[model samples]
Target: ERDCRVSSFRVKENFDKARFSGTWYAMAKKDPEGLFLQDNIVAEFSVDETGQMSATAKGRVRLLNNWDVCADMVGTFTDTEDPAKFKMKYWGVASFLQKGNDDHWIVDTDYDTYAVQYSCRLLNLDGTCADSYSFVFSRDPNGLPPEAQKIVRQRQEELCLARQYRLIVHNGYC
Candidate 1:
């Protein structure tokens, strides 16, 4: 049998890190092979005086066979030649949570309302994605606007992700 691979995707053009810095709520997520972060997801993006991007994301997570708790995760981004692409080193505040370095791509964003992010955690021998995840974020905790929703849905389809994204429930866990 042959392994499945993900197709190539596009990133945001002329990404402005300064404008992108702000609070965003995760409205939906497409999980990778091994799911980590759960509902009530909130992520904050910041740009330092040195013009570097960093982020802190918090979400509910389950561990040890039904042990549920809120997790605070931190990520610092290393810029690539492409402004929209970055190497993200992320880890949980607590060692017991999750930690890894992944490719973080800003697929699309308006800087004020909504953002779409993608990450390919693993690549196959055939040069395709082995494990990957996508996130749909909104500035408003309530959710994305109707126009933004349409754009995000189109982007999800273009990324070849299933329409069945997990609707993140912000139940005040973060």
Candidate 2:
């Protein structure tokens, strides 16, 4: 948490889209301003033959502690010079749900076990992230390996958002 600059953050090296294509359960999360995802968060990442990378995220978003609704959000990623960096254009399945673009950066991943993802919604002039969301994804819905957890924690602290993260629960509904 020493360096709070978003530009100075390091992302995954040689991030492969093909290997990343799969279902990932949200083990933990650092919510952004006006957060959407609540719990039971699951994301499916895929790359088509045309090399277009897209994702679908399913999660619960309760209306201010009132009614609960499941949101199925889809995102199409636009690649940048760095393979790990992408601009995600995401929209919800329902008409009243959320929609917008966010910076999707693959912080790190072990391909089969875990993945760390970060998105900066707004950036400040000082190169710091004003609004951002982050997720520590795991292949297993229950939990992650201790080694993976350690590495994920390291990345979380490096991102300057470890203290902001909270454990995400999964109750079989996605």
RMSD, one per candidate, in order: 2.8, 1.3
TM-score for candidate 2: 0.95
Model 1 clash number: 0
Best by TM-score: 2
Across 1-174, the per-residue lDDT of candidate 1 in tens digits comes to 332344457789999999999899999999997688888999999999999999999889766566778889999999999899999999988987778899999999999999999898888888677788999999999988899999999888777675648899987756
CA lDDT, every model vs. true structure: 0.87, 0.91
Q: Which candidate is the best by lDDT?
A: 2
TM-score of each: 0.92, 0.95
- In model 1, the clashing pairs are none
Error of model 2, residue 62, in angstroms: 3.5
- Candidate 2, residues 1-174, lDDT tens digits: the string is 388899899999999999999899999999998877999999999999988899999988765656767789899999999999999998988877878988899999988999999998889998999899999999999889999999999999999998999999899665
- How many Å off is the CA of 77 in candidate 1? 0.3
